[PDB]
Amino acid sequence: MEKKLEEVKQLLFRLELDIKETTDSLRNINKSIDQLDKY
Amino acid sequence: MEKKLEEVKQLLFRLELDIKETTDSLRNINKSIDQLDKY
Amino acid sequence: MEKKLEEVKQLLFRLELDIKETTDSLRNINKSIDQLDKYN
Amino acid sequence: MEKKLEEVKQLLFRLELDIKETTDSLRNINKSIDQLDKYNYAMKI
């Protein structure tokens, strides 16, 4: 089915954005931990 | 420091859930592909 | 404190493990796709 | 399941690169954690 594959596609686009958000949150966390080095 | 760490910790709990959810969506995608292959 | 940092460190190791499952699932989809390539 | 399949392959590849960013970020975090242990040690005894 090209509809099934179309569905997989749509889910993959969403997972891409979800992973990009996880990355961004981890980068933020990284900065927080950096602060604490001398602080 | 202890306050910041608690905020980081809480965030890491939510990221774990988000990652595990992504993994789950991928395993379901894997199922869909397998079903097409079976066909 | 020591305790909170330890809990954070453990959490980061769990995310390492969780992310490796994501990577492994991706790899398994690729394998399943390759099977289609042959026929599909 | 051909042109569509190729689209899916492109997406799975993109997702692989996205995940690599996530793993790199985790690696950098750990590096900052080790720096934080260095400090904590030196600033104590």
Q: Decide if A36 and B4 are in contact by the 8 Å CB cutoff.
A: yes
Q: Decide if D25 and A20 are in contact by the 8 Å CB cutoff.
A: no
Q: Decide if D32 and A33 are in contact by the 8 Å CB cutoff.
A: yes
The data reach a resolution, in angstroms, of 2.3
Q: Rg of chain D's alpha carbons, rounded to an integer? A: 20
C-alpha–C-alpha distance, residues D11 and A17, integer Å: 12
- Write down which chains contact chain D via at least 3 CB pairs under 8 A: A, C
Query: What 3-state DSSP class applies to D1?
Result: coil
C-alpha–C-alpha distance, residues A36 and A32, integer Å: 7
Exp. method: X-ray
Instruction: Tell whether D9 lies on the interface with A, counting CB pairs under 8 A.
Output: no
Assigned token pair, A25: 């949150």
| Closest among D29, D40, D27, D12 to A5, alpha carbons compared | D12
Q: Decide if B18 and A21 are in contact by the 8 Å CB cutoff.
A: yes
Instruction: Tell whether C32 lies on the interface with D, counting CB pairs under 8 A.
Output: no
| Closest among C33, A24, A16 to B36, alpha carbons compared | C33
**B3: exposed, middle or buried (Cβ count in 10 Å: 0-12, 13-18, 19+):** exposed
